A = this chain, B = another copy of it.
Amino acid sequence: KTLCKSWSDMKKHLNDTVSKSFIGRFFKLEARKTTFTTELRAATATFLTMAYIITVNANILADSGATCSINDCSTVASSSPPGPECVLGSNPGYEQCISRVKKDLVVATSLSAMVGSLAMGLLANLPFGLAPGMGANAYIAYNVVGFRGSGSISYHTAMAIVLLEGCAFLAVSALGLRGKLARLIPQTVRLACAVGIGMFIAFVGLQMNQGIGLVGPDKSTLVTLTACAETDPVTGACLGGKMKSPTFWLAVVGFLITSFGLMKNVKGSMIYGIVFVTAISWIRGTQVTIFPHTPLGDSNYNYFTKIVDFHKIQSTLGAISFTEFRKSEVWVAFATLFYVDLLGTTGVLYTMAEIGGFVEDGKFEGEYAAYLVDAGSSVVGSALGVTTTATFVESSAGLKEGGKTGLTAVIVGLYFLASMFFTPLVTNVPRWAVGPSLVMVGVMMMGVVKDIRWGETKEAVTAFVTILLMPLTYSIANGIIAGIGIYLALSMYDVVLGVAKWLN
Which residue numbers of A lie inside 8 Å of B, CB to CB? 146-147, 150, 199, 202-203, 206-207, 214-218, 220-225, 256, 259-260, 262-263, 442-443, 446-447, 449-450, 452, 454, 456-458, 460-461, 464, 468-469, 471-475, 478, 489-490, 493-494
- Chain B residues contacting A256 (CB-CB under 8 Å) are 489-490
- Chain B residues contacting A220 (CB-CB under 8 Å) are 146-147, 150
- Chain B residues contacting A215 (CB-CB under 8 Å) are 222, 472-473
- Chain B residues contacting A260 (CB-CB under 8 Å) are 490, 493-494
A200 to chain B, nearest CB (A): 11
**Which of A215, A457, A478 lies at the interface centre, i.e. has the most chain B CB atoms within 10 A of its CB?**
A457
- Chain B residues contacting A473 (CB-CB under 8 Å) are 214-215, 223-225
- Whether the pair B217, A222 counts as a contact (CB closer than 8 A) is yes
> Cα distance A471–B150 when bound, in Å?
26
Q: A214-B473, A450-B449 are in contact. Are A458 and B222 (CB under 8 A)?
A: no
- Whether the pair B218, A259 counts as a contact (CB closer than 8 A) is no
- Chain B residues contacting A259 (CB-CB under 8 Å) are 457-458, 461, 490
**How many copies of this chain does the complex contain?**
2
Q: Can you name 21 A-B pairs with beta carbons within 8 Å? A: A147-B220, A203-B468, A206-B472, A214-B473, A216-B222, A218-B474, A222-B222, A222-B223, A223-B472, A223-B473, A224-B473, A224-B474, A225-B473, A225-B475, A262-B457, A263-B456, A446-B464, A449-B454, A450-B450, A450-B452, A471-B472
- Chain B residues contacting A216 (CB-CB under 8 Å) are 222
17 additional A-B residue pairs with CB within 8 Å, beyond A147-B220, A222-B222, A449-B450: A199-B468, A202-B468, A206-B472, A207-B222, A215-B472, A217-B222, A223-B223, A223-B472, A259-B457, A259-B458, A262-B457, A263-B458, A442-B464, A443-B461, A446-B460, A450-B450, A450-B452
- Whether the pair B464, A454 counts as a contact (CB closer than 8 A) is no
A70 to chain B, nearest CB (A): 17
> Cα distance A473–B206 when bound, in Å?
10
- Whether the pair B450, A223 counts as a contact (CB closer than 8 A) is no
A83 to chain B, nearest CB (A): 14
A76 to chain B, nearest CB (A): 22
**Which of A216, A224, A464 lies at the interface centre, i.e. has the most chain B CB atoms within 10 A of its CB?**
A464
| 8 smallest beta-carbon distances between A and B, as pairs | A263-B457, A225-B473, A447-B454, A221-B474, A450-B450, A262-B457, A443-B464, A259-B461
A484 to chain B, nearest CB (A): 14
> Cα distance A285–B192 when bound, in Å?
42
- Chain B residues contacting A478 (CB-CB under 8 Å) are 225
Q: A220-B150, A222-B215 are in contact. Are A447 and B472 (CB under 8 A)?
A: no
- Chain B residues contacting A225 (CB-CB under 8 Å) are 473, 475, 478
- Chain B residues contacting A214 (CB-CB under 8 Å) are 469, 473
Instruction: Look across to chain B and name the residue whose beta carbon is closest to the beta carbon of A259.
Output: B461
- Chain B residues contacting A224 (CB-CB under 8 Å) are 473-474
Instruction: Look across to chain B and name the residue whose beta carbon is closest to the beta carbon of A226.
Output: B473
- Whether the pair A460, B443 counts as a contact (CB closer than 8 A) is yes
A117 to chain B, nearest CB (A): 27
- Chain B residues contacting A493 (CB-CB under 8 Å) are 260
- Chain B residues contacting A489 (CB-CB under 8 Å) are 256
Partner of A447, one of B262, B460, B468: B460
Instruction: Look across to chain B and name the residue whose beta carbon is closest to the beta carbon of A208.
Output: B222
A262 to chain B, nearest CB (A): 5
Instruction: Look across to chain B and name the residue whose beta carbon is closest to the beta carbon of A195.
Output: B449
A139 to chain B, nearest CB (A): 14
Instruction: Look across to chain B and name the residue whose beta carbon is closest to the beta carbon of A477.
Output: B225
> Cα distance A413–B223 when bound, in Å?
41
Instruction: Look across to chain B and name the residue whose beta carbon is closest to the beta carbon of A199.
Output: B468
> Cα distance A458–B265 when bound, in Å?
12
> Cα distance A391–B224 when bound, in Å?
32
- Chain B residues contacting A469 (CB-CB under 8 Å) are 214
A308 to chain B, nearest CB (A): 35
- Chain B residues contacting A474 (CB-CB under 8 Å) are 218, 221-224
Instruction: Look across to chain B and name the residue whose beta carbon is closest to the beta carbon of A146.
Output: B220
> Cα distance A262–B214 when bound, in Å?
38
- Chain B residues contacting A203 (CB-CB under 8 Å) are 468, 472
> Cα distance A148–B150 when bound, in Å?
35
- Chain B residues contacting A460 (CB-CB under 8 Å) are 443, 446-447
A123 to chain B, nearest CB (A): 36
A296 to chain B, nearest CB (A): 22
Instruction: Look across to chain B and name the residue whose beta carbon is closest to the beta carbon of A150.
Output: B220
